[PDB]
Structures are given as C-alpha cells and as structure tokens.
C-alpha cells in the first residue's frame, strides 16, 4: 500500500529510546517517529535522502544520495575516448600526465595535477586523452558555474562536484582557468569574491580532505596561474605544476600532421616548412591553417589540399 512516491520529501536525522528517530523534512519540518519499518539504523544517520510519506511524515524509504544536485549543468562526459595521437608534441607532459595520473592510479601520492599554458592546443583534449587513457571519470568543469549568486553555492557545487564525482571515482576532474576561482586576493576584503575564493578554499579543503585517493584526480588548466599555494602544489592537493609550452615546429609538424591528417591532400606538403613558417601555434592554428587551406583548396578547386594551400592558410593572416 504505502509504496511509493516520486519522489518523497526527504529529511535528515538526529536520534537513531534506541528505537527513536526525529527527522526534518524537505519541507523543513521536524517530526518524531518511532523508527519506521523500511529503514535501518545504519541507513539512518543525519543528512540523508529518505522516502517519507509526505502526509504521515512516516519515512517510507531510505534514499541513496544520487540526485543530490549534480548541478546538472556540471558536464560529465564519461571517460571519452581520445588518444595521445590527438595533438602531438606534448609527450613531455604526456609522460607527466601518466606520471601524475596513470601511475598514481595503478600502484602504491598526488590527487591531482596543475596545467598551465594556453589551451586550444587540445589541453582539453589532453584531459580528454587521459579521459580515455587512465579510464577515470572525466569531469569537464567550468568554474563560471562554481561562480554563483548563492553564498558558497560554489562550495556546495564544489562539494556537489566533489561527492558525486567521488562515486564515479576513479575520476579526473578537469578545471579550466582555475584563476577564475584562483584568486583569494590579499586581504580581509576577500568576501568581495568569497565564492571564487572559498570555493577554492572549499576545493583546497577537499583537496585537503584526502591524500591517497587516485579515484579523485584533479586537473586544472590556466593560461597562467595567478596565486600560488602549496595546496596548489601538494601531494594530495594539486601536486604537479604542468607546463603546456606552445609547441615546437616539428611538434607543430607533428600536430599539423593530425590536423592535415583527415584532410584530402596531394602532398605538395612539407610540414616542417609550414611548421617552420608557423610559430608556437597551439594545435588549432595549424588546424586553422588546415581549415583555411581547405577552403582555399576548394577556392583552388582542389579536392586534395596542397602545401601552397597550407602556405595560404598561413598566408591567411596569422599575424
């Protein structure tokens, strides 16, 4: 009979004499009840999701903490498949990537690493690469969401981000432009943004809450960081300060390769030339050249794309 409703009100707990429990509803209403039938004193504990007859205030079900907000705008692409052949030249850190994530994952430590350098390289992809590679839950997470009107909403979000990810852990939580939340300023004026700060602090505390979980992997990219912390460099917090240098030319020839890859080409191509003529392109500028050369190559009528085409992509002002 009493089963069930979608959803219930939930409530949290104080007492668990010994048969006694008092709970405060999602309606913000406290009832006593002799501990109901469908629940277990261990299931019972404060701060919990529970099925409760809304009318009777009779707890029906214990509820797992699941729809405890994923701030559903939080974007979880689960371990998408991306190679290290995706954007080349980065083997430096790819090692470190492995060294900061893969190896800490599979043996017996860092809970996360810290990117810096401009993305569009596929820094994102690097994450996405390891998202495939390490097979830990990838969280593509924009701090703007962590940036909120509610007070400590972000922290809540961060806690949100923390916990449900800890379920999907092994997880790699990606963060873009940490400096968003990466400035505490200097001062006692910090409530100015308490959000971006405390969220960091909350995060720091989360990064502080554990050490050994490789289940939690924390990946933060910036163009460059602003404030430093031995939280920002720590075993169990952000351990690894990871450079993303704008690649070298053969590395660009390596990356342009991947971009030139799916292109139809007659091989007038010489990459290194392009690679030499180009300077420090994060991958997509090669791809931009790749892009333009194609539009060019069509304007040339060419199905295949040629070196000159790419030269003309370059020619399309790269500055």
């Amino acid at each position: 009979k009493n089963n069930r409703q979608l959803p219930y009100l939930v409530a949290n707990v104080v007492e668990v004499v010994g048969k006694a429990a008092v709970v405060k509803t999602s309606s913000r209403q406290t009832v006593f009840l002799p501990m109901v039938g469908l629940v277990d004193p261990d299931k019972l504990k404060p701060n919990d999701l529970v099925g409760v007859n809304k009318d009777s205030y009779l707890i029906l079900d214990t509820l797992p903490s699941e729809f405890d907000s994923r701030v559903k705008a939080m974007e979880v692409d689960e371990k998408p498949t991306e190679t290290y052949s995706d954007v080349g030249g980065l083997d430096k850190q790819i090692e470190e990537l492995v060294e900061a994530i893969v190896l800490p994952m599979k043996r017996a430590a860092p809970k996360g690493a810290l990117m810096y350098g401009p993305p569009g390289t596929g820094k994102t992809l690097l994450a996405r690469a390891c998202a495939a590679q390490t097979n830990a839950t990838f969280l593509k997470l924009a701090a703007p969401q962590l940036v909120q009107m509610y007070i400590g909403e972000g922290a809540k979000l961060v806690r949100d981000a923390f916990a449900l990810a800890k379920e999907k852990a092994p997880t790699i939580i990606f963060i873009d432009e940490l400096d968003a939340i990466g400035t505490k300023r200097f001062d006692s004026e910090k409530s100015g943004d308490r959000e971006v700060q405390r969220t960091m602090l909350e995060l720091l505390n989360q990064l502080d809450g554990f050490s050994s979980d490789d289940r939690v992997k924390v990946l933060a990219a910036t163009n460059r960081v602003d404030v430093l912390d031995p939280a920002l460099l720590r075993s169990g917090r952000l351990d690894r300060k990871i450079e993303f240098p704008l690649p070298s030319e053969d590395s660009r020839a390596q990356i342009l390769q991947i971009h030139s890859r799916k292109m139809t080409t007659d091989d007038d191509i010489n990459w290194q030339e392009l690679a030499r003529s180009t300077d420090e392109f994060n991958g997509a500028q090669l791809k931009a050249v790749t892009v333009e050369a194609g539009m060019i190559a069509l304007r040339n009528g060419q199905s295949s794309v040629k070196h000159e085409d790419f030269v003309e992509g370059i020619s399309e002002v790269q500055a």
Binding site: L58, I151, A155, K184, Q197, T199, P230
Partner: protein, 358 residues
C-alpha cells in the same frame, strides 16, 4: 533398507531447522509491516510555559503556537527551550524530548581528536609545543583561559594536519568548520549553525573547534558594503559575539585557520577573540632535514637514497613539499621500480621539487 532414517531425518533436520529461519523474517518484517501504522509526530522546543498546560512553543518547523500539554507530560519538566514532540492536528505535545541538531559530522564536522599526533609532523615543533601549552594544558591547570588560536602559512604542511595532531593530543572532540556552508543560501542560519557548533560542543566539551581558512565567513570584508556581506559580518560577528561575548571555551576550544593572517578582521585578531596568531614558517634546512627524515624516510628507502644532500637541495619546502620530494622521487621510484626509494629517484625530484617553486 536403513536409508530411510536419513530421508526421514534429512527432511526432518532441515525442515525442523527451516522452521524459524523463514519464521523469524515474518515477525521482523511484520513489525516493519506493523510500524507502517506508526505515524510521524511534529517537533518543537518550548519557548515557555504560559500556564501549566498553556505553552508558548515555536514549531521546530515554523512559527510560534499556543498549545497545551498532552499526557505522560510533566508540566514540571516542560520548560523553556525544551525540545518536545508535537502534534499534527491536536498540535500539542506528543512527547517530551532530549535534543541536538545539525549534521554533527557534516554541517558540523565531528571527528574525535586527530589521526596522527603532533610528533609525526614534527619540525613544526615550535608551534607543536607552543600551541599545546596554550591549548591543551590550560584545561588541566585551572591556573584567562585562552581565547583563540589562528594558524597561518601554507595549509596542510602538517598545517591542516596540525589541527588533527592538535586535536589528537587533547582528547577533545575535533570539530572542523569549512566556511560558506555556514551561510550558503540559506538566506540565514548563522548562530543556530555556530551555536550548535558552540552548544553541541559546549555540551559535548571537551571539543576542538577548527574553522577552515576563514576568509569567506571571516575577514573584514570589502567596502564593508552589502553583497550579502551583511550575512558575513553577522557570521563574522557571530563568532565575535561568542568570543567578545561572555561565551567561553569551557572544555571546547576553537582553532582558527587561515593561510594568510592579514586577511582577517582586525577585531577578530583581538584578544578576547584570539589570544594566539599561529605562524607556520617553512621548516629550516634543519626543520626540513628534520621533517625530511620524518615524512620521507618513513617511506621505504635505501640508505643509498640520499639523505642530506637532498635536504641541501631541499630549501623553502613545506612539510608536504618534503612529502612531495618523497612523492616525486616515488614517481621515479615506480619509474625505477622502487619500493625503497633510491638516490636516483630522489634528487631528480629534489630539484624538480625545487623547480616549480623555491
């Protein structure tokens, strides 16, 4: 011919044993079945006793109500602030209650003492002693008690761990406070939060109160305008109220946390609120080497593993940076196949540790 006794007892033994296996679950489930008749009953504290029956009780869910007693009720025991079970329709006392609130381990964070003692993070020893005497002891020597103690420097260096190591040494319940949850939104909940943090601890004392890095709920704010900063100031003051106010640390003590001190309300730093401003410098070459052979060498390592020269190259590191030094070589260890770290693993790390920062 005699195989029947089994086929008799075989059935029998199990059968007769299978009796209450099944049968137990019924009544238990039946209780659960039954208890579904047992219905929830509202809660509240007595604001006061109007008449012996007549009560002023603010619903724990909501506003005040004029109510009477019910039954099995002691109009004696019924008293101000007393949690009582209340009625949904009759709207009167459905029972008289003990009381406590809040997620003790969550909104409040309740962990007893600390994981490793002061020694394991030793090399902060100045503080280690210095704090203990100004924190632990004033309990056990009735001959001010201390107001407040504020860490600063880089966290977790042992820094955040200090609290646990602190918390460990006293015996009090360590109660951790992260900040913003104390006023998320949640357009209110200030003292009720903090006083539960006070009062629960005040009842549960000895308790350690540790408030994390308190610049969102601490600090002097900005223009001191209203972002909801007026929330913070309150919250900022709620402590001030408990501190510059008569509320003492009876057996419950308060550890303040910041990574930077100058980030706090000047009035907060004041005695009557804070009697200690706890620095955490970086370990010296000694302190490092101290912490070095502490944090590090306890990870399995060769004597080949380079003890001081690492420390020589180990400079401006913290307690966890020391651990990083270990942890980094550990990369090379798992990279060199080492349970015991080897000097090879090490100083690659050391510079690499001395690389990113000092």
């Amino acid at each position: 011919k005699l195989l029947e006794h089994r086929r008799y007892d075989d059935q029998l033994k199990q059968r007769r044993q299978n009796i209450r296996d099944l049968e137990k679950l019924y009544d238990k489930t039946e209780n659960d079945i039954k208890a579904l008749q047992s219905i929830g009953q509202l809660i509240g504290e007595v604001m006061k006793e109007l008449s012996e029956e007549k009560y002023i009780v603010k619903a724990s869910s909501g506003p005040r109500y004029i109510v009477g007693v019910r039954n099995s009720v002691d109009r004696s025991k019924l008293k101000k602030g007393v949690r009582v079970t209340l009625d949904i329709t009759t709207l009167t006392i459905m029972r008289i209650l003990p009381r406590e609130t809040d997620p003790l381990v969550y909104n409040m964070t309740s962990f007893e003492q600390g994981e490793i003692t002061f020694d394991g993070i030793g090399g902060l020893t100045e503080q280690i002693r210095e704090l203990r005497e100004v924190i632990e002891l004033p309990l056990k020597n009735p001959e001010k008690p201390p107001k407040g103690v504020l860490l600063y420097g880089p966290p977790g260096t042992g820094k955040t761990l200090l609290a646990k190591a602190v918390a460990a040494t006293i015996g009090a319940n360590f109660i951790f406070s992260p900040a913003s949850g104390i006023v998320d939104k949640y357009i209110g909940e200030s003292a009720r939060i903090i006083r539960e943090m006070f009062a629960y601890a005040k009842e549960h004392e000895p308790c350690i109160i540790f408030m994390d890095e308190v610049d969102a709920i601490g600090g002097r704010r900005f223009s001191e305008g209203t972002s909801a900063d007026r929330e913070i100031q309150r919250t900022l003051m709620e402590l001030l109220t408990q501190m510059d106010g008569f509320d003492n640390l009876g057996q419950t003590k308060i550890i303040m946390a910041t990574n930077r001190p100058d980030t706090l309300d000047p009035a907060l730093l004041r005695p009557g609120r804070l009697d200690r401003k706890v620095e955490i410098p970086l370990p010296n070459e000694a302190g490092r080497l101290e912490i070095f052979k502490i944090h590090t060498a306890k990870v399995k390592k060769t004597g080949e593993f380079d003890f001081e020269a690492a420390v020589k190259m180990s400079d401006g590191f913290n307690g966890a940076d020391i651990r990083n030094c270990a942890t980094e070589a550990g990369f090379f260890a798992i990279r060199d196949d080492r349970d015991h770290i080897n000097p090879d693993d090490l100083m690659k790390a050391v510079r690499k540790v001395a690389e990113v920062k000092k």
